[PDB]
């Protein structure tokens, strides 16, 4: 700011940047899809695991 000698715009953009300092708001969308995915995955995983464990001993 002390470089500029036309300074009446550095206060403008300083305050505008610090005003709009949140430039994007948070996203957590992986809490609805991740649990659903995890349920099907877990089910299938466990099914495979138990099935093959049984077969090994058979």
């Amino acid at each position: 700011r002390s470089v500029l000698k036309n300074t009446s715009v550095i206060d403008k953009i300083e305050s505008y940047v610090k005003q709009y300092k949140p430039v994007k708001i948070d996203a957590s969308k992986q809490l609805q899809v991740i649990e659903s995915f995890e349920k099907h995955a877990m089910t299938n995983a466990k099914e495979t695991e138990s099935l093959v464990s049984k077969e090994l001993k058979d």
């Binding site: 036309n6 009446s8 505008y16 994007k24 969308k29 899809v33 659903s36 349920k39 099907h40 299938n44």
Partner: protein, 62 residues
């Protein structure tokens, strides 16, 4: 002597000419907003995908 004459003349008899801040604006890039937060929208919600995926690729692990 001549130094004094020059000093006197220069300082006194003319100074800066007009020059407006408004005219300056044209020659500089002005501040503009960072429009859009740019929210991402949830993808693959529900077991619609899951049923599709379980069924769709049946290729077993080898």
């Amino acid at each position: 002597n001549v130094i004094q004459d020059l000093y006197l003349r220069e300082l006194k008899d003319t100074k800066l000419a007009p020059s407006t801040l408004q005219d300056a604006e044209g020659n500089v890039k002005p501040w503009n907003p960072p429009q859009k937060p740019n929210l991402p929208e949830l993808e693959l919600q529900g077991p619609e995908a899951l049923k599709a995926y379980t069924e769709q690729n049946v290729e077993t692990a080898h």
